[PDB]
Structure formats: structure tokens, C-alpha cells
Amino acid sequence: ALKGSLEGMILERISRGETYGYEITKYLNDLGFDEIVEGTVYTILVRLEKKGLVEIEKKKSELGPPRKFYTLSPAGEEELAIFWKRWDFIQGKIMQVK
Amino acid sequence: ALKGSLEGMILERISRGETYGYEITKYLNDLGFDEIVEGTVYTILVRLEKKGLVEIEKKKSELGPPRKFYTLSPAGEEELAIFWKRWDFIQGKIMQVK
């Protein structure tokens, strides 16, 4: 019911500390959005790197494979800023409709 | 970005006075989505009649074709309330994230 917000919901989670595909997927699941799988998140996480909106600290393990840790870039700091202003707008309009 | 709410927003308009396809579509254009088309509204109306959520007063003219006037059935009343409760639900959670 909100796949549009998913791209900005993720940047929201990344805005409050270094995080990883799993932790971000779990946080979305905890919010009530249990329909999504790890993969769906990573496939947006890849997209956000391509577009330049996240920064990457690749972290190694002797216990398993390497995980990526995600941070907002200045561009992503900006793009998230826009996303919310977009939300505020639409809620506000619906509000006056009601 | 609101093509799914379009059905509920129309029921919202029908809730405050008897009304007709054009007035509905114009009200929509006044709300802001000027991507709307008179046609797009009528198809939804037609579906709403068939779902049993609106009531028809067909009104004639010697000036041109007849126009159906729409008002809410008791079911449409119920259905619109369900939609608002849903917006409330989703606005609340989004804003909690925010």
C-alpha cells in the first residue's frame, strides 16, 4: 500500500546511524511492513549507491561474508529532506480534503 | 502519486451534497491533481454504482443529455469511513517514523 515511500523510508533509517540491509529490513518489518524480504531492501540499497545517495563502509568478517554499512551522503541528506517535504505536502492536502 | 485514493476522494466529494461527474472532476482540479480527466472520474463512478456505494438521481434536460446525480448509499457512507480510518492508520505510522 506504500511502495513509493519505501525508497525514502530506507533513507530515513540510514539517517540515524550506520546500518545494514538486514537491520534496515527488520526495522521496516517492525513498523508493520512485514511483506518485504531482505532482497527487496538490498535491491533498493544498490540503487541508492548508483545514484550516489549513500556512503559505504565495507566491513569484513572471519565469521561470514563481507557486509556493507550505509550512511547518508550529502546528496542523500538533501534527497531525504525533499521526500519529507513531499510527504508533508500530500498529508496537508488530504487533510483539507477531509 | 494518489491514483488509489482517487476512489475515496470521490466518495468524499459525494459526501457533502448531491453532485455530478464534472463537478467532482473540477473539485479534483481545485484540490490540485490536474492530471485528472473528466473520463477517469466517470469510470470510477460507474464502478461505485455497480459496487452499490452511490445513489442515482438521473436528471433530464431539454438543453442536452441527461446527467446522473450522485449521492452516497448507506454502504458508501460505511466504505468512506473505512478509507478515512485507513488514511489515519497510515498517516499515523508514517509520521511516527518521521
Residue numbers in the entry:
A (entry chain B), B (entry chain A): 7 to 104
How does the study describe this entry?
The LftR protein transcriptionally regulates the expression of the lmo0980 gene, which encodes a putative multidrug resistance transporter, LieAB (Listerial importer of ethidium bromide as artificial substrate), and facilitates the export of toxic chemicals from the cytoplasm to the extracellular space. LftR contains 108 residues and is expected to belong to the PadR-2 subfamily. As transcriptional regulators, PadR family members commonly contain a winged helix-turn-helix (wHTH) motif to interact with operator DNA. The apparent molecular weights of both LftR proteins were estimated to be 20–24 kDa, whereas the calculated molecular weights are ~12 kDa, indicating that LftR forms a homodimer in solution regardless of construct designs.
